[PDB]
Symmetry: D2
C-alpha cells in the first residue's frame, strides 16, 4: 500500500514509539528491521507484528559505529536495498544542566547524537543516487524545540539532531541524491516506560504542559512517520513535524 517497496531500519524499534512505527510500516507494505539491545525482547516484538518475511529484529546499539555498516548489510541481505532510516533510539537523563555529570552527558550524547549522526551519514552514503525515494526520519522531540529545566543533556542532543538534519537535507537536495531528511518532534507519549515512572503521565497531562489534557499514544508518531517515509512527502525535506497535543503552541 502506502510504503510499497520500502525497506526500513527502525532503531529502538522493539518498544513504544519505535515499535508502533515498525507496526504501521509493515501494515503499509514496507519490510522492516527493528533494532534493540536485548534479543529475548526484540524477537517477540518482531513476531508480534509479522513473520520474518516482513519484519526482523537485529541486536544493535545505536552508538556502535561499526555495527551500523553491519546492520545495513544484514538488512539488505534480508530485504534488498535500504530505502528508509528512522533514527529513533535514545536515552533520557533526568538532570538539569547544572546537575548533569560528565559521564551522564557523554553517554546520552553518544546514543542520542552520535547514533543519529552515524545512521544519517551512512544512510546518505548507502541510499543516494539509486532512485529509491529514500527518506531519513530523525526523532528530535519537542525537547529539540523548547528547553526543559531537568532535561539539559537531552535538550542538547535533540537540538543538535534538529539542525544537523537540516544540513543533511540541504546537501542531499542540492546534490540531487534522491534522499530526504526530516525531523519528527513528539510531545509526551504514553509508553510502558512512562508508565513505570510514577506521576509522569499525570505531570505531562497538566493543561500547562499538554493543552489537550492527555498524552498521546505511539500510533500518533507512527502515522506521521508513514507519511514521511512514503513518496507522498517527496517535496518535504529539512522540515520539522510536530505531534505534541499543542505543547509547543503555547
Amino acid at each position: 500500500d502506502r510504503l510499497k517497496g520500502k525497506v526500513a531500519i527502525v532503531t529502538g524499534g522493539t518498544l513504544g514509539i519505535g515499535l508502533a512505527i515498525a507496526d504501521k510500516f509493515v501494515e503499509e507494505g514496507a519490510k522492516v528491521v527493528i533494532t534493540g539491545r536485548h534479543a529475548d525482547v526484540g524477537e517477540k516484538a518482531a513476531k508480534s507484528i509479522g513473520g520474518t518475511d516482513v519484519i526482523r529484529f537485529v541486536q544493535h546499539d545505536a552508538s556502535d559505529e561499526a555495527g551500523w555498516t553491519k546492520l545495513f548489510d544484514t538488512t539488505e541481505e534480508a530485504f534488498g536495498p535500504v530505502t528508509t532510516v528512522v533514527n529513533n533510539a535514545g536515552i533520557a537523563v533526568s538532570k538539569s544542566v547544572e546537575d548533569t555529570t560528565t559521564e551522564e552527558w557523554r553517554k546520552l550524547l553518544s546514543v542520542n547524537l552520535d547514533g543519529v549522526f552515524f545512521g544519517t551519514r551512512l544512510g546518505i552514503q548507502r541510499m543516494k543516487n539509486k532512485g529509491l525515494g529514500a527518506s531519513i526520519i530523525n526523532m528530535s522531540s519537542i525537547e529539540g524545540l523548547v528547553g526543559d529545566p531537568t532535561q539539559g543533556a537531552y535538550n542538547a542532543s535533540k537540538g543538535a539532531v534538529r539542525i544537523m538534519s537540516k544540513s543533511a537535507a540541504l546537501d542531499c537536495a542540492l546534490k540531487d541524491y534522491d534522499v530526504r531528511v526530516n525531523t519528527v518532534h513528539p510531545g509526551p507519549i504514553k509508553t510502558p516506560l512512562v508508565d513505570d515512572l510514577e506521576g509522569a503521565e499525570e505531570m505531562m497531562s497538566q493543561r500547562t504542559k499538554t493543552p489537550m489534557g492527555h498524552i498521546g499514544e505511539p500510533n500518533d508518531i507512527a502515522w506521521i512517520c508513514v507519511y514521511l517515509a512514503s513518496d507522498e512527502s517527496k517535496f518535504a525535506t529539512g522540515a520539522e513535524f510536530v505531534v505534541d497535543g499543542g505543547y509547543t503552541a503555547q
Copy 2:
C-alpha cells in the same frame, strides 16, 4: 481502506491549483467535499472533473464574504451532513514591497487572506465543536508565513497572521475539549497554471538559492499533507506548522 471515511470537508478556493488537488485527494480518500470559488463555470467544471454530486459539489463563494460563510456551511450540511473539516485555502497575491503597497491593495489582500481565514475558522469552531466528529481546521499559511520576501509585504503580513491566529484557535479548542484541531500548512513554490501563466516564475523559484531541490512542487504535494491533517491519524497534532517546501526554509 479510506483514510477520510465519513469526513465532510469545505475547501475554499478549491477549483484550481492546490485547493483542487486537496479536494481531489479528499474525495479519493472517502470524504464528501464542497469546493468554493468566485467563478461558476470554472467551479462547476472543477467539481465534475473529480466526481459526481454524491461526493463533491461547487458553491460560489468569496471567502471574504462573511454572510456567505454561514450559508456555505448550511449548504454543505444539507448535502452531506455536518461539516467535519475546513480547509481555508482561498488566497490572493500582491507583487509589491511593503514600501510600494497601496492601501487598497493591502486591504483587498487581507480581506481574503486574513479576514476570510478568520471567518472560516471562527465559524468552523462554532459549528463543529462538541460533536465527536474529529473535526480539523487546516489553514494554508505558506512559507511566506515563516520567512519574509522583499516583494510580498502584504502577503507576508496575512500569512504570519494566519500562522499565529491558528495557534490561538488550536489552544482554545484543546483546553475546552472541543474535539477540533487547528493546524497550518506552509507550501513552498508549487506548480499551478497560475504559476505557468507568469513567465519565468517557475524558473526563478527553481534556483537553488530559492528551492534547494532545484524544482518547484506539485499540487498533490500539498494534498497529501492535508489528508494526514484531516484524518484521525493526526488526532494528537494541533497548533503545529507543516512545511512542504523543497528545503526552502531550511537554509
Copy 3:
C-alpha cells in the same frame, strides 16, 4: 543625558503610557529627540513634559490607524527636530476574546490599530528615511503573542504574527536596495503597564511559573533598553530579527 542615540530623531507611537513612555524616556536620556503620539491630548502633553522640554520631546495627537495623519506627523516631527531617523511602531490594543468569541467589529478595530497602524508607519518610514545616510531604524512592537498562541487573545495573536513577518519583508527590501534602513521586531513578554493593569487578573495569571519562569512580569524599562540598542548604530548589522525579552516565557 548621555549619547548612544546622538543625532537620532524618533517617532514613538503610543508613547504617552507604559512601554512607549519608557522608550521615549530612555531615548531622550541617550540623546535622541522624540515625538510621542497618543489619542488623548491631556495625558499626552503631560507625558512629554514629564520627560523633558520641547527642545527634546514633543507630543502629537494622532491615532495610529489614521493614515493621512501619518504624513502630517512626519512633517510635524521633521519641522521640529530635522529628518526622522527612527520609527517605533508601539501603539497597540488588546481584546480578551477567543477566536470563536471574537466579533467582527472587535477584529477589525484591533487590527486597524495593531496591524494597519504598523503598516502605515513602516511604509511611510521607509519612504521618508531611505537613502539619506541616517542610520535609520524601524522598530515594530510585536509580542510573545507573535510567537506563541493565547487561547483568549485571538485577534491580538493575528495582529502580532502579522507584524512579525511583515517586518521581515520590509527589512529584506531595505537591505537588498541599500536604503540604510533596518527593520526589527521586539517581542516583550508580560510587562506591568496600564494595558495589563486594567485586565483583571492578568498580572497574576502571567506571573505564574508555568507562564513566566522568572515568577514575575517585567517593567517598561526592560523594553526601552532593547529598543535603545535597536535604534543605535551599535545594531547596524541587525535586521529582520526578533528580539525577545520575556522572562523565559517562550523558552519552555
Copy 4:
C-alpha cells in the same frame, strides 16, 4: 560604565569576535579574563586591551574540563567572583554530514558543545545565589537556526548550544538563581575563522546569503553581548539574539 562591577570570562577571547567582546567589556567597566590555547597570541591580546588591573589571559582549551575549574579559581583570585561567562570558543569543519569523519565530528563537538556545557554548568555552580546579576552568553550561530550543506558537525554543535541554553535559563529562573542564560546567533563576521576559509567572505557576501551584501564585523557581536551582560537585560533569559545582516529573515 554599563558593565560596572562585572567580572567576565570570555573563552576564545584572543582573536576575532571574542577579542572584540573583551575589548568592549573592558571599555564598559568590566574586569575580563580571556582564554585561548596559544599564549603567544593571548598575552599580546590582553596587553592590546589593557593592564592586568582590567584584563588577564589564561591559557585554556575549552574542551579541557579540569582546566575550567582552574580558570574560575584564577579569575576569582584576580578580580573577585565571576559574574559573566561568554562561551565563545569554537571551531569549524568544512564537511557535509556525509563527508564528516568521526574524528572531525568528535573534535569539533568536544570544543563547540562540551566546552559550552562545561562553562555553562560551572558558571551556574559558581554564580548561583550570589545576587550578582549573573549572565551566561552562549555563542551559537545562524547555523544553529538554519542548516548549511557543508558544515554538518558545526550545525549539530550550534543547534545543541541553542536548546541546551534554554534548559539552563529555565532552571536558573525557576530556582531564583539570579543567573540568566541567552544565546547569540551571529551571521557571517569578518574574523580569522572566516579569513582562513578561502572564498568564504565572498560567498557569504552574496545577497542570496546576506541580504545586506557584506559580512559583519566583530564589534557587531560585541555590542549585543554588552547588552546581555548588563543589568539592562534583567528580563531577558532563554532567548536567541540574532545579528546576521538579514541572513535568516529570508
